[PDB]
């Protein structure tokens, strides 16, 4: 099983940016994570660990 | 300048598609599109190969088309694309979006015999037109040939196909297909869903277009599509 | 209305790694590109450009 470090830079409805960090996710985990994200995507970084 | 006889021989186009495609040769954009395609072919690795670019004209005639499934551009790795949207060559394991399309077929029809393969020629011969708006791509770069004129040319073919007679079924998956192709919903059966990509908001396995399209065909006294593949 | 650049570092069945650069895509286009990806993802970068 490949595991990944997933980083997102998101922007809320007020225009405020923030980072969210996720360690050890599989690609399926990333897909559910991406699918459930509601705020605007500024950056996405997915790296095999 | 651009002659139909030369155009269909160079691209192996079925002449049954002539009334729908030949008027595009009078659009000055077509000459620019062909010269840009000829130039890219000499400077980069272009997919699918030339004989496959218009394979979508070879499985059925315009009068045999029942369903239009819209795609974007071809798969960008050698051996994948063969001129139809979503479909892959027989020896190729189905990529993620195509696996989701096949799971939705199987959920719609639990008794369908699915091969596990991703070659959709069987659907194409049955009047399922699997049409990308962009017909070529540079290897390794998605949407690289998306701004050379293919969507305008293909856009013209779809408009004339839709104008021939009412009653087509359109399956428009994702934002791009829904924004680009807007048929009149009182003339054609227009079906919309999120994209089969695993990254979509809703799982594609829940899509019932295959059943809805078949119930529509029955009301028009047309036999249903066998979605097994 | 947002536009994005997409960079991937992928690995083929022979273990050879290679870069792919996808420029000026909509977020929906990125989602389609991902669903067409078959080789092993080593790195993925998605950045809003406009």
Residue numbers in the entry:
A (entry chain D): 7 to 55
B (entry chain A): 16 to 244
C (entry chain C): 7 to 56
Sentences from the paper on this structure:
Protein p56 of bacteriophage PZA, when co-expressed with HHV-1 UDG in E. coli, appeared to form a stable complex. Reminiscent of inhibition by ugi, the UDG active site is occupied by p56. However, where ugi achieves this blockade with a distorted edge-on beta strand, p56 almost exclusively uses the alpha helix of one of its monomeric subunits (molecule C). Contacts to the UDG DNA-binding cleft from this p56 helix span Ser32 through Asn42. Several hydroxyl and backbone oxygen interactions closely resemble those formed by the phosphates of the DNA backbone in the kinked conformation exhibited when the uracil base is flipped out. The tightest point of interaction in the p56 complex appears to be the minor groove intercalation loop of UDG. The apical leucine residue fits into a deep pit between the two helices of the inhibitor dimer. This box-sided pit is formed by a rigid interaction of mutually perpendicular pairs of residues from each p56 subunit helix. Glu37 and Tyr40 side chains from p56 molecules C and D, form the walls of the box. In the apo form of HHV-1 UDG, Leu214 adopts a conformation similar to that observed in the described complex with p56, with a shift of 0.5 Å in Cα position but with a similar sidechain conformation; this conformation is also similar in apo human UDG.
